Amino acid sequence: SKLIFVSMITRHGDRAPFANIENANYSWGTELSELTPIGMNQEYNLGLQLRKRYIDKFGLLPEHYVDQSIYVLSSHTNRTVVSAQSLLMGLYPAGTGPLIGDGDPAIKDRFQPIPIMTLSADSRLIQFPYEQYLAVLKKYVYNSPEWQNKTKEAAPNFAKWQQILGNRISGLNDVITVGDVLIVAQAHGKPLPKGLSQEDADQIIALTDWGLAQQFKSQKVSYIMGGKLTNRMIEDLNNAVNGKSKYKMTYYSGHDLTLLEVMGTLGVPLDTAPGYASNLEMELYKDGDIYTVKLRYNGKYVKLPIMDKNNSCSLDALNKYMQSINEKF
Amino acid sequence: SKLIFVSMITRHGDRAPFANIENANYSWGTELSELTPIGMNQEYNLGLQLRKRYIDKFGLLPEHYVDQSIYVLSSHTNRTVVSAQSLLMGLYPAGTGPLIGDGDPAIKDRFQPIPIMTLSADSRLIQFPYEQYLAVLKKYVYNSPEWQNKTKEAAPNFAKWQQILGNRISGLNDVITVGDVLIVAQAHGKPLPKGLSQEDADQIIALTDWGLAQQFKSQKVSYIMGGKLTNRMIEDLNNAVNGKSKYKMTYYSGHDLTLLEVMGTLGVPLDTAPGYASNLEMELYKDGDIYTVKLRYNGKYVKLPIMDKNNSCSLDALNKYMQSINEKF
């Protein structure tokens, strides 16, 4: 059995927050929502790891980039484009890029350009536009019993958190909003907002992790947002077998939501919110006329209901599995 | 008076042809229409030149990339994305990218990622989709007296060229089609197709250059294809003055057609088809409340009808000029 194709999703690397904590004076060194140098490094290192795996170990890809061998598609955000670029700088690093003349580098340090396409901002493929995303949550998630129950649990802290942070805290949605700022703050070694204990910060962050994961616990919600991408990735696998495509890899540069919605669509929803540079790979193997698939998330194989003791199933089985999911929704 | 903003268009670098000559056996070392190592180098070197100009000389941009300082938009093609990437590797070269921790590079060799967005394939902004482009030509160009006359002059050669090349040659459009292959062949030092004299090759290539330029000599045709981009670039200038935008540069990575259509829209159509890495800059200067614009093409200033002896006009004047063009079409 040989690996013949991979489809991959990443979450982008460390970024500045989207929001501000009203009562704190954090400065990030970059614009809101932009990838930080740390985030570039995280994706670059993931790239190096993917080289060791898919080039060195499996030999799916060669050491020097082959034009049209990898299709890369990113959501329409700076952080996801720059994350893809950074990852690709690890996958095909300086020293491997093309030469001209007599071993003279096309670009200094033999950098390797690899094209990245972006979706439009209004595309729903890699992430739902923000307002549409929130609309899905309002409709299917916020009034769910699990969400209401957890809200009731945490509600006695809202007043306190609101007065400490300044930001409105009137529901778990608001907790998630400030929780991201605290995650970024912690990742950059910034002090706690005055009057916010480490205990409080931990609780807010824990509620944020819980909330993000809980949103995609519903296969229905996951499918609404992630059905299209999940179908596309599986189609990519099929195109590697039916002669339609010569790509060795398709790579979708995305968000925590992207990973959550695909895993959730496949019926293996994540128990924790994807951290920076989290990644998922669909691996396609060929042994003669036999085609097998494995699903890898953050370095570990994932067992779909249709998989055997070896965390594997036939591509045919995967197709049947996906077909059933489509018919279901 | 200081430079405060630039909007730039490039043509991509050296590429493989789109088509092939039936009776030749050319192999290109890359896939059709893809950027070659030479093309990456051309764009990289343009990047270095732009650094010397807009960083070293004018100081519009700093030596180390500022997030959200440059907006880059490319057509939906590998060659234009890879060209932009390559150019940006010259503009902000290895050694200038971000650090983490104690002066340790975020990415090896201190590469600087700079985000590039792509239009959709069906966007008409940077280039018209192929069939739509040809439709414009068929309607406005092919039956024009200049095109017919040149066709009649060249026609006595069609039969010969057809039998030699194998490719259909029944009009100037076909000459332009094979002319591109011969341009690429010459750029890569490939031998002439058997039976095609250097004289014939030169004639075909000359007709190709002529034909591409002639297409955009009509301001009407130029406006159909280039009016939207031309308006956008001038709007970018206005946004640097009106507070709408904080970008120091907007950069549209495009094609010969992109350069041709903008120059043609502005009433200064090119006499020669843009070569690889050709480029156009709209420069905006500020001296107090006085705003002045200059137009640079391939390293030389271009005099719009509304400009003075110094190849300059007020932004107000450029706005009025563009407004009149809009009302004309």
Is residue A95 within 8 A of residue A109, CB to CB? The reply is: yes
C-alpha dist (Å) from residue A88 to B92, B106, B169: 18, 14, 43
Alpha-carbon distance of B125 to B103, in angstroms, equals 41
Peptide-bond breaks in chain B following residues (C–N over 2.5 A): none
Interchain contact B131–A (C-beta under 8 A):
no
- Which has the closest alpha carbon to B266: B213, B318, B211? B318
Contact present, A137 and A173 (Cβ < 8 Å): yes
Determine the Cα angle at B61 with ends B57 and B65, to 5°. 130
Range of the domain at A241: 1-329
CA proximity to A167, closest of A136, A193, A205, A131: A193
The encoded tokens of residue B96 equal 């200038």
Nearest to A233 by CA among A5, A25, A1, A46: A5
Least CB-CB distance to B118: which of A40, A100, A117?
A: A117
| A309 touches B at CB < 8 Å | no
CB-based burial of residue B139 (10 Å sphere; 0-12 exposed, 13-18 middle, 19+ buried)? exposed
Q: Which residue shows structure tokens 């300082």?
A: B69
- A87 interface with B at CB cutoff 8 Å: no
Q: Judge whether B194 is closer than 8 Å to chain A, CB to CB.
A: no
How far is Cα A137 from Cα A124, in angstroms, rounded to an integer?
15
Interface test with B, best of A77, A100, A120 (most B CBs within 10 A): A100
A85: nearest Cα among A13, A187, A33: A13
B80: CATH = 3.40.50.1240
Integer Cα distance of A144 and A139 in angstroms: 9
Which H or E run contains A2?
strand A2-11
Cross-strand pairs, A284: A5, A293
SS (H, E, C) A262-312: HHHHCCCCCCCCCCCCCEEEEEEEEECCEEEEEEEECCEEECCCCCCCCCC
Please indicate the experimental technique that yielded this structure: X-ray
Instruction: Enter the tokens of residue B299.
Output: 């390293």
d(CA B256, CA B216): 11
Whole-angstrom distance, CA of residue A229 vs CA of residue A261: 9
Cα separation of the two ends of chain B: 34
SS3 readout for chain B: CEEEEEEEEEECCCECCCCCCCCCCCCCCCCCCCECHHHHHHHHHHHHHHHHHHHHHCCCCCCCCCCCCEEEEECCCHHHHHHHHHHHHHHCCCCCCCEECCCEECCHHHCCCCCCEECCCCCCCCCCCHHHHHHHHHHHHCCCHHHHHHHHHHHHHHHHHHHHHCCCCCCHHHHHHHHHHHHHHHHCCCCCCCCCCHHHHHHHHHHHHHHHHHHCCCHHHHHHHHHHHHHHHHHHHHHHHHCCCCCCEEEEEECHHHHHHHHHHCCCCCCCCCCCCCEEEEEEEEECCEEEEEEEECCEEECCCCCCCCCCEEHHHHHHHHHHHHHHC
C-alpha A203, offset from chain centre: 24
- With a CB cutoff of 8 Å and minimum separation 6, the contacts of A253 are A9, A10, A12, A72, A73, A74, A75, A80, A81, A83, A84, A87, A116, A126
Residues of A in contact with B37 (CB under 8 A): 98-100, 106
The 3-state DSSP class for residue A127 equals coil
Give the pair of three-digit tokens for residue B196: 């095609």
Which residues make Cβ contacts (< 8 Å) with residue B198, sequence separation at least 6?
B192
Give me the residue from A37, A94, A106 closest to B37, CB to CB.
Answer: A106
Which of B65, B88, B107, B114 to mutate: most A Cβ within 10 Å?
B107
8 A C-beta contact, residue A109 and residue A99: no
**Best CA proximity match to A294, nearest among A80, A85, A60:** A60
Adjacent-strand bridge partners of A8 = A251, A281
Task: Please report residues of A whose CB lies closer than 8 A to that of B68.
Answer: 31, 34, 78
Q: Which residue of B has its CA nearest to A42?
A: B106
Distance CA B303, CA B322 (A): 15
Measured from the Cβ of residue A244, the count of other Cβ atoms closer than 10 Å reads 11
Exposure string of A180-200, with b = 16+ CB inside 10 Å and e = fewer, is bbbbbbeeeebeebeebeeeb
- Nearest in space to B319 (alpha carbons), one of B255, B225, B242: B242
Phi/psi at B229 (5° precision): -65, -40
For residue A161, list its beta bridge partners. none
- Chain B hits for A90, Cβ within 8 Å: 107
Closest B-chain CA to A40? B106
Q: How far apart are the first and last CA of chain A?
A: 34
Does A85 sit within 8 Å of B113, measured CB to CB? yes
C-alpha distances in angstroms, B194 versus A80, A185, B28, B165, B189? 49, 68, 18, 8, 15
When divided into structural domains, chain B yields a total of 1
Name the nearest CA neighbour of A321 among A269, A250, A265, A274: A265
For A28, B100, B105, B106, B212, the CA distances from A37, given in Å and listed in that order, are: 11, 6, 8, 5, 44
H/E run at residue A90? helix A78-91
Token digits of residue B31: 């896939």
C-alpha closest to that of A92 among A114, A59, A117, A115: A114
CA triple B176-B178-B179, angle to 5 deg? 55
Structure tokens at A137: 């949550």
Beta strands in A93-187 (DSSP E): 99-100, 104-105, 117-118
Are the Cβ atoms of A113 and B82 closer than 8 angstroms?
yes
Q: Which residues of A touch B81 (CB under 8 A)?
A: 115-117
Please report, to the nearest 10 degrees, the dihedral formed by the alpha carbons of residues B223, B226, B232, B233 taken in order.
-110
Q: Do A132 and A257 contact (CB within 8 A), yes or no?
A: no
Place of tokens 């995303």: A133
Residues of B in contact with A76 (CB under 8 A): 117
- On the CB side of B230, CA atoms within 13 Å amount to 27
Which DSSP state fits A169?
-
Q: Specify the pairing of strand B117-118 against strand B70-74.
A: parallel
- CA B129/CA B107 separation, integer angstroms: 37
> Taking the CA of residue A33 as centre, how many other CA atoms within 13 Å lie in the half-sphere pointing to its CB?
9
Maximum Cα interatomic distance, chain B, rounded to a whole number of Å: 71
Residue A36 near residue A28 (C-beta atoms within 8 A): yes
The resolution, in angstroms to one decimal, equals 1.7
Residue A242 DSSP code: S
Written as six digits, the tokens of B175 are 């000459």
Query: Rounded to a whole number, what is the distance in Å from the CA of B149 to chain A's nearest CA?
Result: 42
Task: Check CB contact under 8 Å for B34 and A108.
Answer: no
Q: Are B116 and B84 in contact (CB under 8 A)?
A: yes
Cβ proximity of A134 and A215 under 8 Å: no
A311 interfacial to chain B (CB closer than 8 Å): no
Please tell me the distance in Å from B36's CA to the nearest CA on chain A: 9
- Which helix (H) or strand (E) segment holds residue A316: the answer is helix A315-328
Contact B293, B284 (CB under 8 A): yes
In Å, how far are A41, A103, A300, B75, B79 from B40, measured between CA atoms?
Answer: 25, 15, 38, 17, 9
B217 close to B267: Cβ distance less than 8 angstroms: no
Backbone angles phi, psi at B249, to 5 degrees: -150, 140
Cβ separation B100–A37 shorter than 8 A: yes
The residue type of A80 is: T
**Residue A253: φ, ψ to 5°:** -90, 115
Instruction: Tell me the two tokens of residue B274.
Output: 């843009």
Give how far B14 is from chain A: nearest CA, Å.
12
* Helical packing angle, B158-165 and B198-215, nearest 10°: 110
